[PDB]
Amino acid sequence: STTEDLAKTFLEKFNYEAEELSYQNSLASWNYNTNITDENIQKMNIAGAKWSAFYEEESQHAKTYPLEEIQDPIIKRQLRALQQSGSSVLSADKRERLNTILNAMSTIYSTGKACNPNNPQECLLLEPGLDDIMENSKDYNERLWAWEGWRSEVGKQLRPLYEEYVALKNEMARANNYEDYGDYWRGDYEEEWADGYNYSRNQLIEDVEHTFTQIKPLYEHLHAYVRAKLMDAYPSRISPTGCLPAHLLGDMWGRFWTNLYPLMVPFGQKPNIDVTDAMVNQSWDARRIFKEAEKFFVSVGLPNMTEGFWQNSMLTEPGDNRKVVCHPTAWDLGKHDFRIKMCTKVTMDDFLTAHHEMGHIQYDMAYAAQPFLLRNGANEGFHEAVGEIMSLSAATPNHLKNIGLLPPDFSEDSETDINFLLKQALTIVGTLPFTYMLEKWRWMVFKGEIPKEQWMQKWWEMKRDIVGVVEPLPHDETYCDPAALFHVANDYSFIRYYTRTIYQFQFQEALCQIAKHEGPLYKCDISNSREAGQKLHEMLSLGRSKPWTFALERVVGAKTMDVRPLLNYFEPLFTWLKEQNRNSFVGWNTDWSPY
Amino acid sequence: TNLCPFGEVFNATRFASVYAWNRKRISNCVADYSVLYNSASFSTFKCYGVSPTKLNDLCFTNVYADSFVIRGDEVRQIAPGQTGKIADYNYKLPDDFTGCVIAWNSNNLDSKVGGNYNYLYRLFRKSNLKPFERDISTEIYQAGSTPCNGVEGLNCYFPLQSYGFQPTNGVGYQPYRVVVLSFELLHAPATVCGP
Ligand SMILES: [Zn+2]
C-alpha cells in the first residue's frame, strides 16, 4: 500500500465531495448576488461555511501522505494545492488574532470616509463619492483634500493594524518553511518538479525587475507627454523636468491614467470610434450583444455557449424588486454550470465587457474536464489575460465593419489610431510602474529590508524613483499610504495585475502571427481565424494541470514573461511619443516636490 | 394477447440507482421495438451486436431491462469495453454483449432544487465487477492496510456516493435514465418473438 495509491484514492473521494459541496456554495452565492435578501445572505454563509470546513478537514488529511513519496505529477499538483496550510499552522490565539486584524482592515477600508476641511459635513466614502472626485474633477485643491484625507483619516488607522499584520503573516510563513510572507505570495508563481519548466520564487523577482527595465523608455515618453499636458491643465503646478503629483493622475491612487485622456488627446478634431449609437439605430438589446459576442468565439474556433447558459445567466437587469450586484462577473459554478452576471446596457463599453466576460467563460469551459483542484488558470494572471485579448480584437474597426456597427465605406484614419493607442497606454503602460512598485515595497517590508521606521520613507523614495510620482504633502511614519489601496488592506497579491498585462500582449502577438495579420499589432483582429483559437485552446484546456511556464510556451513559445510584445503594441505610439517629446525633457528628478 | 410492458420500465415514476439496478424479467409477450427507436425522445440509442434496424422477427428468450440513473458524462461508460467508476464498480457490461442501451435526459424528472440525492453510485471497491454483477453491500472500504473497525475515518471511506442532481446543472452533469435491454438468444423456447 504505497502512498501514491493512498493519495489517489483520497483525491477521488475528495474531488467528488468538493465538486458537490462547492457547487452548493456557488449556487448559494449566485442566489445572493442576483437576489439580495436577508435569507440569501444566511444561506450563502451556511453553505459557504460547509465548504470552508470541509476544505480544512481534508487539508489535514492530505498531509498524511508525504509529498516526496508521490511520483505521478498530476497527484502532486493537487496535493500541493491541498496541503498548503495557511493560518491553521498558527496557534489558537494567534489565528484568532490574525482574522481579527484582517476583518478590521477590511471594515476600516470599506466604511472609512474622508471629510472636506472646508465643509466638515461632507464626509464621503470611497466607492460612492470619493472616487468621483479623483476621476472627474480637474481642480488641484479639490483633488488634494480627497487624496490627503483618504490617507490621513483612513490610512493612519490601518498603520497600527498593518504592522501586526506583517508579524503574524511572517510567523505563519516561517512555520510553513518560507522566508517571509512575500515569499509566500510568490509561491503562486512557483513551479516545482519540472525538468526544464521549474520556476523559483526568487526567479519572479528577477523576471519582473528585468521586464520592467525595458518599459522604462516607453514609460518615460508617456510620463513626459502626460507631464507636458498636465502642465497645461494645471499651469504653474508641475515643473517641466520633475515628477507628477499623486493627486493629478486620474485616480485615487494613481493606479490608472485613463481619466486624464480628456486632458491629453493627440487629435481633438478626430473623435474616437464609438459604436454605441449604431446599436440603437439597429435596435440592439442585451441579448443581441451576447449573441454577437459568441459569434466572435465561434468564428475563432471556440465552441458555442451551453443550453443552460442562456436560461440561467442574468444578461439584463431584471427591472424588479430584486437587488442585484451589477458588477460584470463570469460564474463557473461547477458541474458544467457557466453563467455571466452583468446589468448589460446597449453601449460600447458593455459590448467589449461581454467579450471579456465570455472569454472568462471559454477558459472555464475549457478546463472542465480537469480535476477539481486543477480547474483554474495556470497562475493568478493567466485567467484575466485571456479575457483581455477578446476585448482587444472586438474593439478594432475591422471587426466593427464586419458586424454592421460601422459603414462599409469606413476609411481608417491614422490620426484616430494615435487617439486609440494613447488611451490604451494610459490604462496599460500607466499601471505597470504602479503595480511593480507596490509589490516591490511590500516584498521588502515582509522580508525585512524595510524596517517599520522606514515604511513611508521608502514608500515615497521608491515612488519618485520608479513611478515618477511625487507626493503633494509630506507623510511621516504615522501614515500608511499603500494600505489605502484595496488589495493591500484586504490581503491580496497585487502582482497578478503586472504579469497579466505582460501575458495579455504576449498572447496577442502570438495569436496575430498565426492569424497572418499584416500590419501593426494594435490593428489586429483574430476573428474568422480558426488557427488563433485552436492555439489558444491548447493552453486553455490545460488549466492548472501543467506549470504556467509550460502553458506560456504552448502559445507564445517562451517560458518566461516578455515585455517586448507589449512594446510592439505601442510602437506606433512610441514613434509618435518621441516626436512629440522632442521639445520637452524626458525623465524626472526626485529632488522636486510640490511642498 | 398479452404484450411486453415497456411502459412499466421506461415510464416508471421511480428509477433505481446504478449500484443496485432494477432488473425486470420480461417473457411470454409480444414486443414492438419499432416504437422504441421511432420515439424521437431518447438522447442515446446504441444497440450492440443486434442491429437497431427494427428487427421484429427474432425470437428471444428473456428481455432483461436494467433500469438505473447515472449522470450524462457517464453514459459513454455503458458501452462494452469501457472504464470508469460506473463500468468497473457499478454496472459492467460484457465484451460479447448483445443488446441495446437506451438513455434519455431526465433533468425534468430526477432533478430538484437544492439537489436530488436519492441516487447512489459506488465510488470505491476492492476489485472490478463481473459482467451483470450487482453488489449492494455497504462495508467500509479500507484504502491501505489499517483496519477501519466498522467506522470510516483516515484512509477508510464509505463506498457509496450520492449524485447531486439539480435542474441548473450542465448537460454532462445531468441525470440520464438508462435502460439496458439484454437479449439472451440460446437453445430455448424463445417466448419473446414480437411479430
Ligand atoms: Zn475579467
Distance from CA of A386 to the nearest CA of B (A): 23
CB–CB of B82/B121 below 8 Å? no
Compute CA distances A341 → A31, A294, A309, A376, whole Å.
11, 16, 11, 19
**Domain edges within chain B:** 6-120+164-183
Q: Ligand 1 centre and the CA of A357: distance in Å? A: 6
CATH topology of domain B6-120+164-183: Alpha-Beta Plaits (3.30.70)
Compute CA distances B120 → A163, B71, B78, B117, B158, whole Å.
52, 11, 16, 7, 12
CA-nearest of B150, B183, B166, B194 to B49 is B183
Residue type, A466: I
What's the CA gap between A128 and A11, in Å, rounded? Answer: 45
CA-nearest of A218, A511, A538, A561 to A393 is A511
Pairing of strands A469-470, A244-245: parallel
> Is residue A357 annotated as a catalytic residue, yes or no?
yes
Q: Tell me which DSSP letter residue A259 carries.
A: G
Give B164's contacts in chain A (Cβ within 8 Å).
20, 23-24, 335
> Is residue A336 annotated as a catalytic residue, yes or no?
no
What's the CA gap between A366 and A543, in Å, rounded? Answer: 8
Q: Ligand 1 centre and the CA of A540: distance in Å? A: 15
CB atoms within 10 A of CB B126: 9
What's the CA gap between A29 and A19, in Å, rounded? Answer: 15
CA-nearest of A435, A20, A497, A77 to B161 is A20
CB atoms within 10 A of CB B2: 7
Phi/psi for B153 (5° steps) reads: -140, -125
Confirm or reject contact between B94 and chain A (CB < 8 A): no
Task: Please state at what angle helix A414-428 crosses helix A203-233, rounded to 10 degrees.
Answer: 120
Confirm or reject contact between A592 and chain B (CB < 8 A): no
What's the CA gap between A173 and A89, in Å, rounded? Answer: 9
What's the CA gap between A545 and A366, in Å, rounded? Answer: 12
Distance from CA of B34 to the nearest CA of A (A): 30
Confirm or reject contact between B144 and chain A (CB < 8 A): yes
CB atoms within 10 A of CB A433: 24
Q: How many residues are listed for chain B in this entry?
A: 195
